Amino acid sequence: MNVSIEEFTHFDFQLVPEPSPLDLVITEPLKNHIEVNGVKSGALLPLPFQTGIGKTYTALNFLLQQMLEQVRSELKEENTGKKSKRLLYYVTDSVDNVVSAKADLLKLIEKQTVKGEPRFTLEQQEYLKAQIVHLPNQSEQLLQCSDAVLNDVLIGFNLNAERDVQAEWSAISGLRRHASNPEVKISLNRQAGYFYRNLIDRLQKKQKGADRVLLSGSLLASVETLLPGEKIRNGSAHVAFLTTSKFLKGFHNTRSRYSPLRDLSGAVLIIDEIDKQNQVILSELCKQQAQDLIWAIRTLRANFRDHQLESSPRYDKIEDLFEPLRERLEEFGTNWNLAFAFNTEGANLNERPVRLFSDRSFTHVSSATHKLSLKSDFLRRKNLIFSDEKVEGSLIEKHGLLTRFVNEADVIYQWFLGTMRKAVFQYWENVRGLEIEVRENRSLEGTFQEAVQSLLTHFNLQEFESAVYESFDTRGLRQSGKANKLSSSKSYHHTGLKLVEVAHNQGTRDTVNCKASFLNTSPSGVLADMVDAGAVILGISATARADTVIHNFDFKYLNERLGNKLLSLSREQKQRVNNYYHSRRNYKDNGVVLTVKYLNSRDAFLDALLEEYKPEARSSHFILNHYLGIAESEQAFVRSWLSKLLASIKAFISSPDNRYMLSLLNRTLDTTRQNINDFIQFCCDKWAKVVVFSTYASMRSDIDSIYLEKPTQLLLSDDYSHTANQLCQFHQILSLQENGELSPKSAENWCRQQLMGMSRERSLQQYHQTSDYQSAVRKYIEQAVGRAGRTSLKRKQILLFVDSGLKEILAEESRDPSLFSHEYVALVNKAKSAGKSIVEDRAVRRLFNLAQRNNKDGMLSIKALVHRLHNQPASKSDIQEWQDIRTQLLRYPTVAFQPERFNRLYLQSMTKGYYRYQGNLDGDPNSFEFFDRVPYGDMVSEEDCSLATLVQNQYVRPWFERKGFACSWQKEANVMTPIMFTNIYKGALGEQAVEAVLTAFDFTFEEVPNSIYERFDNRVIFAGIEQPIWLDSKYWKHEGNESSEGYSSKIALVEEEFGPSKFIYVNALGDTSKPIRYLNSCFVETSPQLAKVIEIPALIDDSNADTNRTAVQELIKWLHHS
Amino acid sequence: DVQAEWSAISGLRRHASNPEVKISLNRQAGYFYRNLIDRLQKKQKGADRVLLSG
Amino acid sequence: RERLEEFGTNWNLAFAFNTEGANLNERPVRLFSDRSFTHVSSATHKLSLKSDFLRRKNLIFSDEKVEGSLIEKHGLLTRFVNEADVIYQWFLGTMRKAVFQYWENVRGLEIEVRENRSLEGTFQEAVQSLLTHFNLQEFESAVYESFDTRGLRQSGKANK
């Protein structure tokens, strides 16, 4: 009796109902995005729809139109082919919110009318309502199922034989019978969840393909009732109403578990309260299980040494993916001696556990006062963590560093997980190609578990399944932000954070475990990956475009990665929405005024009210210290709170029209404060001849009076565990650092304070001095005032009371009040008339902070890369990164638009093309100063690089033109950062200028080979000279801290690796007057015949840039003498 | 988690009349004993010993 | 360790195991032994084990079902199972002996401290220390059951 699509054959699809302006402002940008981009590209469309504007109605109308479009498409196609219908989702944090919407959708199908007549007959309604599935949590899903459905499921899959499941079901039924007092209800929910998990586990174990039950008829209907996921899987339904946690974790069907994050192609999501999800998504990304990085790496090293996969047409090109991981693991084991275990040696370490924090790019914090070193004691056969001496010098240690070990271990572990994901993808491709004969055509969903189990059983890595299962959904969309290399789009939102605890094992007192908590991506990165995967996300929220990074998605990063996919409404659409809001919500017709009264901390008024409360008391301190339990520190805070709350309640009582007051208070008061509340009630008893003390984070008569206390603690805190809260705090700090509100110095100091353990008060004090705090204050005020009023009829006067600490914040609002509600614009208007306020632009502070941040990242990354380029062998990827940085800085010293790939090589400068700074390029990164704050410091422009002088050479120009190097610095507001400018640009210009001037006399050059790279610019072959020729060109005479030891060591290494080799040192710019000086191994003047180093102060003049032909000829003669 | 589990156990014990409640109460009490004893023996392993007395 | 590496070399533990041939993919193969003189199998013909280097995998196959006629020289699943069981029980017994030796050494070293803990106090510590040193923590549960069921011998001999 199933309803067929053939019941839509005579429906008029071309007839759509009369559209409201909201429908147009949704459909027009989507059509423009369809025209501009492709038809298989997702887009995020944040829509600022207020309350009582038609939010749910418009979203559900969009859903119904998409469903009808799918019906039309399926009817038209029919015999052409069979495809899975587009998946539509409705996601909201609240489980209550994702019930009513679904219900409302059904109501829509029942009540939508066109031209005054029903748009659908009963058959269309029955078909359409059968394509919507609501899939709650497992406990409520089990309690929903009746007895007949569960009994039929138990019988059909042969479950009565096992007495364990029968006992569990008997207990579940027994407690479900007596689910009257909540005490029974809590245990019923818990045991129901456990039974649901066990039943689904056994059901999917049985239905794997062996002894298939061949669901049909009554059993199929019962299974669908128990498991709504199977309704989607077969094809009956394609609209799912669910929560964000269920969206991320996934639901269950007969075959396996379906997480929508892996197959989002042509998926239309509707996210209600899009901003708040940033918190909720975080609450799921912070629940990851800590993994011991010693056990994991040792297991991988032991198991990857010999275990090999099958050489079958199914495992083709799946072994080559794992090789580089194996040659990295063997080297990691050899260097760190993973054969032995690890231990903590010495005092101050067996008592204090070691805590480490890393952003993986430039923010590193250690809980130890001295750098922690690892030594591999062969005689004791163990690895030891130690601090050793705290004195300066005195036989400094050269064993190792714990931070390098931890970072490399994390890199290897995440490399293994990513390689497993790629291998699963390749396995799916091979299986599909080999089973082309079979018409199954299963996607990655049907092959994910099979691939994971096969690979892990072949490699004996069955312990990692959960890991590969956990790191496949939340961060599994990374395959569909790039790496941390300088050519990649470096950002915290897709790099993450790592928190490591080194502490002794359970029971054991001589082995140590290194637990690691990871946060690979931010919620903003997850949303960007959703859009990149092919999901059209429609997020509805009044404050959907707030300028916060803690309480909202980082829209600056979203715009820098999506591009044109972040569909932004035009000014016409926003003004149309404002006109619609005024039409459907007008206070002029009723004559409703919005009263704003800023309440100050009137201590005298509070004292007078206290005296009226107890006239016989000699002083209020006796009551405060005993009755109210007030200490010395809390005195001012409690006094300020009471002095304003009392005034607000008294004013609300004095109002002859307002009947309901909703005060927004952080804490839910106390019994001691309840006594004063009773005093207020006693006063109101005589004043008259209802009141709610709400909370910011909570979850008939209309609200006509609201009090807005200053937003208290605003840093999101997770209470699932302790590591979750630590990860959340570190995420907030690093997101603030990336946005630009907190300078690297402040962010590093805050991270260090948090790692050692710090009170919430100090963290909030640290947060309060950022512009994000004021932005979140304004956003919370907007949300609070938006909910104040839900009826079409309003009284003449509305009371709006604001804490006097919000005067500055609300008086500094600078956005156009187009979409702002009546209450918020009233508050802004009232505050803006309070004299004058000095406004400091967030742009200037953000620009300075981001410049310092980019310089810090540049210096730390350059040092790490150079250090990684001085070990044997030199990795090929690092050579490519160095060359790419050099070439990009050569071609594009200054760019107009914000670069997307080569991100942190540039800073946006106030004055275009140049900037003044003051700092040292060998020391503390978070001590640099930029721009106008150091007007008499170092200068970065085209003048100091002397490019105008260097381009005057007749051989510089041909090389610059042939290779495309920029001969001038284009004046734009994105210039090279200090570290990059000095080192990279000076070196690149010097090397290329010397190459040109030597090519003028047919000199042949080759890149420096092997791992001796970064020591010399390039190997030289010229005129068939048998001995090798090496060169170290500099833009100017360079003598750094390494100096004598530096070049002596490099000369010795070159000589001992490649034998005799002439050395040349030339400064491209300078004076040509100084003749050739012959230097020994220690750069001391010696005999020309015995010399091994030649020097040229200037092959290119500093005045007319003439080529030093005499110097080149003398160098040729010196090379050709013997 | 422990507080919620113990609250549920106490609530069920207040109304342990029918057998259906009895079997589930027994199972829940067993699980709670396992969890509580595991936590108590982890805490008493040698770090900040509780020093039982009286 | 010597026996483990010899077993890995002889039976090619570098590769996984799979069943090749019809009639073996439907009924799982059941084997039974008393470790002395009784051996029972669920296979009509004796099952052999072969290491295919090209496919890089170990195979359980029946081969010819005839009696005699130049019997194969590949191997037998029975020997693999018996040897694996012997090595596993050797590991458990060696762990018990190591726990005893650990208790003796710890008491001898800490005679200065008046704790003088018995085998009960040192058993869990010894198991955890040895398994963490050898990175065999997942065997922990086994050692917690193969210490009283057959562990009273430390306080029957072998099958020779």
Side-chain angles (χ1 to χ4, degrees), chain A residues 413-479:
Chain A
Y413 187 46
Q414 302 280 348
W415 194 358
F416 166 75
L417 287 185
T419 309
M420 192 67 41
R421 188 186 65 240
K422 290 181 192 73
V424 164
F425 192 85
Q426 191 66 53
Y427 177 94
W428 166 57
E429 264 179 0
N430 300 6
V431 173
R432 197 177 74 248
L434 191 150
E435 300 300 312
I436 53 170
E437 191 271 331
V438 194
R439 300 295 181 185
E440 41 188 1
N441 205 242
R442 279 300 313 183
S443 58
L444 193 75
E445 293 295 330
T447 51
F448 169 48
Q449 283 185 358
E450 179 176 301
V452 159
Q453 303 278 69
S454 300
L455 296 161
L456 292 188
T457 43
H458 280 90
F459 288 122
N460 207 62
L461 298 176
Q462 302 158 238
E463 306 93 314
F464 290 106
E465 290 178 9
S466 182
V468 185
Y469 280 6
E470 290 294 327
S471 167
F472 200 80
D473 296 331
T474 61
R475 64 177 292 277
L477 287 85
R478 189 172 176 282
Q479 173 176 240

Side-chain angles (χ1 to χ4, degrees), chain A residues 4 201 221 273 347 437 578 656 662 687 794 857 884 980 1006 1024:
Chain A
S4 56
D201 187 285
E273 315 289 321
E437 191 271 331
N578 168 57
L662 179 79
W687 285 339
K794 277 277 190 176
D857 197 4
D884 267 7
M980 300 298 174
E1006 290 86 4

Side-chain angles (χ1 to χ4, degrees), chain A residues 96-347:
Chain A
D96 197 344
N97 265 341
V98 191
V99 161
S100 312
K102 182 203 183 301
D104 278 25
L105 185 48
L106 268 57
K107 206 85 181 304
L108 192 61
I109 301 174
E110 186 67 61
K111 298 299 182 70
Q112 199 145 357
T113 56
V114 170
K115 210 185 167 56
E117 61 187 301
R119 194 210 192 165
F120 291 142
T121 56
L122 317 160
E123 193 79 6
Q124 290 90 19
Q125 319 185 81
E126 287 176 353
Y127 177 45
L128 284 186
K129 288 154 64 78
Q131 279 172 132
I132 317 180
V133 286
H134 166 50
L135 61 84
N137 45 68
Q138 291 142 337
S139 176
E140 215 171 79
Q141 189 44 60
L142 196 82
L143 279 72
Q144 277 178 356
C145 302
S146 71
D147 301 296
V149 55
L150 277 169
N151 286 128
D152 285 330
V153 163
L154 283 162
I155 287 175
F157 304 111
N158 310 303
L159 295 167
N160 295 296
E162 290 82 358
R163 63 181 60 84
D164 292 331
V165 305
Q166 280 306 117
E168 294 171 358
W169 166 231
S170 65
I172 285 306
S173 46
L175 282 71
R176 201 208 291 187
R177 298 294 296 163
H178 292 355
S180 307
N181 49 301
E183 299 89 62
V184 188
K185 180 181 56 184
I186 303 168
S187 297
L188 178 56
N189 291 353
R190 294 265 313 285
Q191 284 160 112
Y194 271 102
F195 173 49
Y196 201 106
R197 271 172 275 285
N198 275 126
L199 189 145
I200 297 311
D201 187 285
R202 305 204 180 189
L203 178 44
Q204 65 87 30
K205 183 69 68 66
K206 295 291 185 181
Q207 268 272 9
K208 224 65 171 165
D211 54 276
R212 165 160 296 119
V213 189
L214 201 75
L215 313 182
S216 293
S218 66
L219 187 54
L220 175 69
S222 308
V223 168
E224 287 176 356
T225 302
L226 173 68
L227 273 173
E230 174 67 20
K231 195 84 163 294
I232 281 187
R233 208 201 47 74
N234 56 43
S236 192
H238 73 95
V239 175
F241 281 69
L242 75 164
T243 50
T244 307
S245 296
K246 213 65 176 302
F247 189 85
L248 299 166
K249 295 301 297 203
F251 43 73
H252 272 114
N253 57 64
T254 56
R255 210 83 59 191
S256 186
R257 142 177 282 186
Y258 188 46
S259 188
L261 275 180
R262 283 82 57 84
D263 190 14
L264 276 157
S265 295
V268 188
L269 278 82
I270 296 177
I271 304 185
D272 209 310
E273 315 289 321
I274 182 171
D275 46 329
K276 169 143 188 64
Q277 323 281 320
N278 191 359
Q279 162 180 340
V280 168
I281 291 183
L282 205 58
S283 277
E284 281 282 347
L285 268 69
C286 289
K287 285 175 68 173
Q288 289 177 357
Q289 215 73 69
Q291 195 63 263
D292 182 61
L293 286 183
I294 315 169
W295 166 77
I297 301 289
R298 287 173 98 195
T299 296
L300 291 178
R301 185 197 168 249
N303 289 140
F304 270 118
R305 182 186 321 274
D306 272 343
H307 303 169
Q308 297 175 359
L309 275 156
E310 204 184 348
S311 73
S312 66
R314 169 150 66 202
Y315 295 114
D316 206 64
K317 295 186 287 184
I318 211 167
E319 178 69 28
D320 305 357
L321 282 175
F322 283 100
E323 214 171 300
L325 184 58
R326 302 149 82 113
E327 292 83 4
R328 172 100 189 89
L329 269 161
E330 58 179 2
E331 271 204 81
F332 186 83
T334 317
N335 268 19
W336 288 114
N337 292 121
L338 289 171
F340 318 132
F342 291 71
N343 199 4
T344 51
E345 180 184 8

Side-chain angles (χ1 to χ4, degrees), chain A residues 803-959:
Chain A
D803 169 78
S804 285
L806 302 189
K807 208 152 189 183
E808 295 181 354
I809 307 180
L810 282 179
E812 281 211 357
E813 173 67 26
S814 69
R815 287 180 299 172
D816 190 74
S818 63
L819 301 166
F820 288 162
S821 72
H822 284 129
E823 293 90 355
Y824 190 88
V825 74
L827 304 171
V828 166
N829 277 357
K830 166 79 195 188
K832 280 287 303 308
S833 74
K836 298 295 289 183
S837 308
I838 303 298
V839 173
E840 290 87 4
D841 269 10
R842 306 155 71 154
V844 174
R845 269 215 301 106
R846 274 190 173 132
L847 203 57
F848 173 73
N849 291 350
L850 289 176
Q852 190 165 352
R853 193 276 315 272
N854 284 0
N855 189 66
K856 178 184 207 188
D857 197 4
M859 279 196 291
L860 288 190
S861 64
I862 279 294
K863 287 184 188 295
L865 189 63
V866 170
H867 164 250
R868 206 165 70 188
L869 279 173
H870 278 289
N871 51 45
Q872 55 181 356
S875 179
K876 198 254 166 184
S877 174
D878 296 333
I879 311 292
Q880 197 70 73
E881 274 300 319
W882 193 256
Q883 291 206 278
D884 267 7
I885 293 167
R886 290 167 75 80
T887 302
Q888 204 275 335
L889 262 50
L890 277 163
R891 294 180 183 174
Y892 304 82
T894 302
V895 302
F897 291 165
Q898 297 290 105
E900 54 179 1
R901 272 255 307 279
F902 277 107
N903 195 349
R904 312 211 190 160
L905 297 172
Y906 297 105
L907 73 165
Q908 171 149 7
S909 171
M910 294 296 177
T911 62
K912 318 186 172 183
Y914 58 91
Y915 64 94
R916 292 179 181 176
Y917 74 94
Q918 175 70 69
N920 63 6
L921 281 73
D922 50 354
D924 215 349
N926 50 8
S927 84
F928 279 53
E929 286 302 282
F930 281 85
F931 296 139
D932 291 331
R933 306 208 197 175
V934 288
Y936 316 113
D938 287 331
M939 186 68 201
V940 174
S941 75
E942 198 189 310
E943 196 272 331
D944 283 330
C945 71
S946 308
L947 196 51
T949 307
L950 202 60
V951 296
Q952 292 168 37
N953 184 295
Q954 65 199 325
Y955 299 108
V956 166
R957 294 300 293 266
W959 200 273

